[PDB]
């Protein structure tokens, strides 16, 4: 239930959903993350050749505004086959190839919106995703066929048409807003109608384990840099430069933040509860890491939900397995590995 | 380990055409996909067209329909027929190839200019 009103290069991981067994169906994953802007070309290679039917997740981004994507495909690895992932991006002189080296908590609802302008190529690209905790449950893509808000989790498919109509009406409103803003921000920063620019929106609400309201968010960004955001008290704005102060004043004079507070404190919480209940078999589970040590000292963790975890040198970003679970490892060059997870009885410790 | 010999570049009038050719050395079983990326005014190089030894092709959106890639049944050699060239196709075109172990090799490139 949504509202009703710089360049970073990617990090690449190539891995399987499950541990590889020669002859056993599996899933090959390429997780690209931490990059900006969102234009990226990702290929999955099999023996120096492009794999034909590769799918990918809906575009989303992290706190720092950097985007992340999961490209994946079903495959049965054998003895001779070798695999890799290729990534192109504006920050790369040539596409990078990475080979597949075979050898009790709070809750949240978050909506992510991304608009990218396409000078002289039609409307801007618009992508919207919705999350409960670390489980995405709705999406919208302007380039897609439906032109509707679409489910991405079982527990949201129960909702009837009045819900899906209202969501489709609300997302298209979020789209129009971004389209207008793209032309506006172009004007206030004196940029040409020939360049491509990105506008990102994020908002949502947190609740304790008692499902009572904890925190609320509403942030806006231009070309990967902060533009305006709601303070933690949800009653005032943070403008980032002389251009965003003009918006801050127009919004404080129209008391926009008051309508936001109501949603973030009331409506957002209310539907987060309805979702948590409707998908309790999913959202309210906790899966514990299937964990062991790899020797360079490397600590491993597989098939755990939610993604929040701590291992304590090289620490690789947590990555989706593609089945709802996540993975992570850490490395260091009389040593111990500490594993604080929100689904383990008590912290674990590991040593050779 | 592999060397890529490029030819066919140069200057051409708008609306003209050019045929690029790239030939791989080494063992005939040491290269699978071959194709071309092209330099942007910026830092990156964009995909133009490539083809697997079995004939599977992929093109960059901005040359779809105008450019065609092909391969010699015998030798490891690919051909890029560029038609209806525009000034925005001016760039250095780099041939590349992939080993059957997903190792990438890259040629020196060939400047293509469209008045």
UniProtKB/TrEMBL annotation, chain A:
It is found in: Cell membrane; Membrane. GO terms for cellular component: cell surface; early endosome membrane; ER to Golgi transport vesicle membrane; Golgi membrane; lumenal side of endoplasmic reticulum membrane; MHC class I protein complex; phagocytic vesicle membrane; recycling endosome membrane. Residues 289-349 form the Ig-like domain. Its main location: membrane. Keywords: Disulfide bond, Glycoprotein, Immunity, Membrane, MHC I, Phosphoprotein, Signal, Transmembrane, Transmembrane helix. Disulfide bonds join 205-268, 299-337. Coiled coil: none annotated. It is a single-pass membrane protein; Single-pass type I membrane protein. The keyword ATP-binding does not apply. It comes from the Eukaryota. GO terms for biological process: antigen processing and presentation of peptide antigen via MHC class I; immune response. Belongs to the MHC class I family. This is MHC class I antigen. It comes from Homo sapiens (Human). The lineage of its organism: Eukaryota, Metazoa, Chordata, Craniata, Vertebrata. The gene is HLA-A. The chain holds residues 25 to 298 of 365 of the full protein.
